[PDB]
RNA sequence: UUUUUUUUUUUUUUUUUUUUUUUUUUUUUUUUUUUU
């Protein structure tokens, strides 16, 4: 009966595990074919609503018929427009579904330099960020920055990035949920460092372009080493309460 | 497939997202309408009745139904006065309406000076405060105070008036608020830190006009740099219990 | 629109705003109304009764009808009497109505110097708070005593002797209310803080006569420094659970 | 109207309050009523079954139909005798009924020196408290020791003889009752120092009486100063989880 | 009425308590009664089903019924053997009637020794006991265990012995009972130390022959003092959580 | 009566208590009829189908019909051909049954290769493992690498790969179970000490074919001495939060 | 001298939340609690 050490003496196929990792994985974020949904409602002018869609996931959320309830006229009818034509919904929706947070999510590089400019209409503002951490990352405060992380780059220096990036989200986690308040780093943290890791090691836009775009917001030099910015978020996390 | 490299090399345009923002903004309390109601109702006795009503809330409440139950007769036939003309409500209504709590924020800079005459008539009174840092700013003593704060002021320097005005707010919230009482200073500091940081940044009042309040007041000098009062009160917050 | 910088542009004027807080205060004043309706009711023997209500708030409770159903057949005449001739209730009533805690308040002298006699048959003992303060004033082992401070005094004295009073309300309230036991010291304090400082601050008995009494009662010195025994009280409650 | 300074100016008279504080007493337990109904029931074998019953109360417990269950053949029959003899409840009744408890109580003498024989059969036993203060007083061993403390004793030796008797009570009250073993020190002390002190300033047995038993246990000296065993077990209090 | 001073000056008969106590003990005491029950029902065969019940109550439980559900053929068929012919229990039923558990305690000497062979197949493994603890004893790895402890041992001696047993107990209780999980170390000690302390001061089995058997099983030197294993183990029972 | 003693006194078989022991042990055998269910529904391709398994169980979970939800149609397809085939279920279901984790968990050795390839797509990533402890042991990133501890390998050596291997489960059960999140490393290490042992004392796979795979792995030396990762994993457990 | 638990637990690019929260010279509890 003990045939096993048969089946474990077996020499392990990295692309034949590579396949079926693919194949059972967890779908639903879509980010590739968000793009694809996109152009198919949109058509030529998705570029432009698109950047609309940013500017909204980030300042109100990802609901769209609860933020349309408190809004001006002007906005109203915007919002509505982009709901009867990409179809939008609020929550977790199926694959061919699409949500305000997933257009952000897929076009993470437009979403990261928005926060430059929507610094102080965020849920958590750059200056109670600057009081946690000096001088903190604009372009880490929104859950989206996680598609932009280079997994390729060093140990040390991954870690600092997604820790530094965590300090954020410990605070934005707690702002949209209520309930995560009185709870503690530990319990925050497990619920928003999975769906990080999954955009961090995610095939959508290469290791190398990954990291051209990290370099450009001035978060890593030339190399791949953080910034003092950056160095100080990630020690301020571990100390972090 | 992958063309939101192209989408997000695209260089931002400041204004064109400043546009949307102002659209697609949030539909809550704006201290305009509440001026606009109060000589719609009021008429030309607006001044008189607005400097009754700050120091009401100042003293009592927001509710106006349930302070009445506990009150002088002469106090009973004034407060019932102001709520059958300015129709004065209780809680978190609708943009039309109009409560206490909201004439105290549209008109900062008279609730601030006021604090200065009712001091020890406050829920926390000014010696409480002075027990926690001693020689507390007194104009920093109501959630108000936050419509008179300059966002313009360097880093440093706005964290230090913020951080200030946050250890009353520590004590005040935790006072109106009694299921906060048991819960950590960052579980409170949760609840205030959302609509203190939207009144800094709310285009009401110029940010030389707000700058000018708080050198009248005695809070930052000719610069711009806070007095030895407000440093104490913003180092006595970071090792608040 | 803005032109709530003229609003706040004005001089404030002391005195206008003095007149809507005595008009706006909480209740239609007590304690001159407690004693015009002894005289009112008892007539001439109104003080004699008045010595037997502050014994018999101090050593049972506030509830007559209640503790009237556990009491000697003497006693059960005597209380009975005080009820149908005074209108005793129990409570939180009207300005008009009378209740064993109103008299004992409005006769804070006599209230704190019964104390030094009924040490031992209080709900708290003068030995349980000899245990965590050594030599714990008697006077001051009453939520009454707040009437006795003078608010005139200097902030360090003031904050000294309000301290020192809180260790004993501290103890006092999670005895009278069950469910403050499991609640912490800053839970606690929040329930008796408000009524304490509105006794102090209450405008009945002047500011010399007050400081006076604490003379009397060997509280504080001649020019106003309270004595070791009360700076000893204010430094455990610092350090209380 | 305020005359209340002169009725504050009066003389308190010592035994004038004296007099209405024993009218104005709580009933509850009974001391003199429980003799009296134990010379009821028993008649003239009423000496011998309540050193039965002392040695039943600090070895089992209060319930006498709960102790039946587990218990020889000998028992079942003699307790059973008690029962229908002296009418003997459970818990907290009217003062015209008799428990378990109410007899140790009442008969405090025999019940400390019983301890000494009954050291290792009790629910907390005196190797266990030898743990926490070495050669810890046996006498002090059950909550009926209060009515054997003189409240007349100095402050400090007053103390002394309640914080190494609370010592006891902290250990066997959570033993007892379940839902006091996760609750601290502070709050273990708030529900047995209320029956505590009520048996010390109880009139049954002198002031002078009551510091003979203490002298002929070993507990205190000639003059009142408690031994070093009495000293350590206060001290071991102090430092108390 | 205050005759109970006479009723308490008489002297205290040793032997006629001692006779009471033994009287109205807690039916349990089946050391005796299983031995007397097993010779009954087993007959000659009482020994070697003996040996077979120790391993079957130490490796599983005391719920024969409910171990026999997740059993093998060869299991199902020798237990209920076991059950059909001594009339085996389960929980705490009467005097006459026997446990597993109960076969286990009464024969604490071989139990002890079947814990060297049982290390790995307890509910606490002996390796996992070796963490807390450097080489813990293997022979205190059950609640029987208490029935082997010698009672007339030295204060010092006596005590680390019965800290160093805690230290399962603590283990064991929180696995055993899974409320018992989230409760601190004061909550759990609580529940096991009153049958311990009753093991211990038990008449079955003299002080010199449980003295003997430590000394046999390497627990306790010639004289009484324990080994450096047990020492251990007790210092570590003093910092566990 | 005292006939214990002699029962006692005799000298213990080893063997003959190895006899019961297996006799009485808990289920029938699993692991073994894993293997024997796996060849009966798979015939021939019963390996391929196992290695798709044991990638499904790593990557997702043991839910099957819920992972189907949010997943691709490729990987829809697969996962239902082998639930129809193999009868999978979910949760703890009879001997009869089989689960995702109860493949991984018989086929321990790939289980512990998958996890060299499948790093960052494991719930807990290699990186977050490496932030704990340098060179955090990939092959211990799974429940399942209990079966492929050696038991017996040297006491200090032995608890060297429990404690290092407790790190992952520290971390994984907090993930997987929300409810854990908040409660301390001891109440976490309650829930997954007991299945881990159980799998280490198993008697599937010899002592010396496991002592080789931990070998093959990299994990312990020629004689059996566990690597620096190792060492430094078991070292961060001990003051792990 | 009781409690005898079980290779289990499989969570989720989302939980997207609001210038709000306005509490009270009040609260007046009782040699009890007796667990295995």
Redesign the interface.
């Known amino acids: 009966?003990?045939?096993?050490?048969q089946?474990?003496?077996?020499a392990?196929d990295?692309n034949?595990?590579?396949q079926?990792?693919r194949?059972?994985?967890?779908?639903?974020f879509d980010a590739?074919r968000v793009?694809?949904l996109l152009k198919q409602y949109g058509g030529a002018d998705w570029?432009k609503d698109?950047?609309?869609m940013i500017?909204?996931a980030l300042?109100?959320g990802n609901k769209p018929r609860r933020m349309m309830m408190?809004?001006?006229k002007?906005?109203k009818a915007?919002?509505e427009a982009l709901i009867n034509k990409y179809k939008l919904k609020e929550g977790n929706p199926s694959?061919d579904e699409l949500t305000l947070s997933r257009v952000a999510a897929?076009?993470?590089?437009?979403t990261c330099?928005?926060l430059?400019?929507?610094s102080?209409?965020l849920?958590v503002?750059g200056?109670?960020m600057?009081?946690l951490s000096?001088?903190y990352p604009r372009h880490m405060m929104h859950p989206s920055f996680a598609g932009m992380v280079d997994?390729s780059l060093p140990?040390d220096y991954?870690?600092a990035i997604?820790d530094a990036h965590s300090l954020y989200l410990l605070q934005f986690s707690?702002?949209i949920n209520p309930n995560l308040?009185?709870?503690?780093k530990?319990?925050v943290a497990?619920t928003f460092?999975?769906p990080m890791?999954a955009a961090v090691?995610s095939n959508?836009?290469s290791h190398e372009?990954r990291r051209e775009?990290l370099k450009a917001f001035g978060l890593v030099d030339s190399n791949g080493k953080p910034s003092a910015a950056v160095m100080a978020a990630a020690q301020a996390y571990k100390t972090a309460?």
Chains 1, 2, 3, 4, 5, 6 share one sequence.
């Open positions: 009966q003990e045939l096993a050490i089946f474990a003496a077996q392990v990295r034949e595990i590579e079926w990792v194949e059972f994985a967890y779908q639903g590739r793009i694809e570029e698109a950047k609309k500017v909204l300042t109100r408190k809004m001006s002007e906005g915007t919002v694959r897929a076009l993470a590089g437009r330099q928005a430059v400019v929507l102080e209409w849920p503002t200056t109670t600057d009081g000096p001088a997994p140990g991954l870690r997604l707690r702002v308040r009185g709870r503690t530990e319990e497990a460092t999975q890791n090691n959508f836009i372009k775009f309460a």
